[PDB]
């Protein structure tokens, strides 16, 4: 498989990177998420549960709170802020609040799946990816970072 042929560069703590270039539609099917401010979480809800409801994202946000409780203090991305664990949760858990790499990292440890964020072009072309956890991409949760501000969901075809 092509996606599994991609080599990943570990750079810190089971966080891997990779810089290919290909068209997402060739390998992935895209399931679009609304422009909520919750699209990051919706994206997880689409891939993690059987049936995705509009209120499911709160179950993954529930998991985040549980995950931050025990992982925040050892997260590399968090360290490079100077924001306390408590300072972080009273903002992340508020409605319509953006998320991304920090929460991807934490959650991958918590739900024990590996999560990937595929940075994409206005030409719907991937140019970079970050993997969180040691998994291969097929058995991983694949997310697409659309603008520099949006997340949609991806299923391997």
């Amino acid at each position: 498989d092509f996606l599994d042929s991609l080599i990943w560069e570990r750079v810190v703590d089971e966080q891997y990177i990779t810089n290919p270039t290909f068209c997402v539609s060739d390998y992935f099917e895209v399931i679009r998420q609304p422009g909520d401010g919750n699209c990051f979480y919706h994206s997880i809800a689409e891939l993690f549960f059987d049936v995705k409801t509009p209120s499911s994202f709160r179950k993954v946000k529930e998991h985040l709170q549980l995950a931050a409780e025990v992982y925040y203090d050892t997260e590399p991305e968090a360290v490079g802020t100077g924001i306390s664990k408590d300072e972080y949760i009273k903002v992340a858990m508020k409605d319509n609040e953006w998320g991304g790499s920090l929460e991807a990292s934490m959650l991958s440890k918590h739900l024990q799946t590996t999560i990937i964020l595929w940075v994409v072009n206005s030409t719907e072309q991937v140019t970079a990816a970050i993997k969180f956890g040691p998994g291969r991409v097929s058995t991983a949760l694949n997310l697409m970072h659309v603008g520099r501000t949006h997340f949609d969901a991806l299923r391997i075809i």
Binding site: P76, E77, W98, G100, S101, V119, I130
Partner: protein
């Protein structure tokens, strides 16, 4: 002293820098040259993310070294 900085899309940046320069210092130099805001930069070398307080020599970064630049991805 020229160092190398490799981004997520595989793009390299050449940077003149002095071993005594802090990590905040280097990030500020990246903003100059590439328009990347410091608060959005993750500087990774040797298997660890650099911290603002320390200098370049505290992670023993010397001469032709290549650090990773990872953008803090939010959305």
């Amino acid at each position: 002293m020229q160092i190398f900085v490799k981004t997520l899309t595989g793009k390299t940046i050449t940077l003149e820098v002095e071993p005594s320069d802090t990590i905040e210092n280097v990030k500020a130099k990246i903003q100059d040259k590439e328009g990347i805001p410091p608060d959005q930069q993750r500087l990774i070398f040797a298997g660890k993310q650099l911290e603002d307080g320390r200098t370049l020599s505290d992670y023993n970064i010397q001469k032709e070294s290549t650090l990773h630049l990872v953008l803090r991805l939010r959305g």
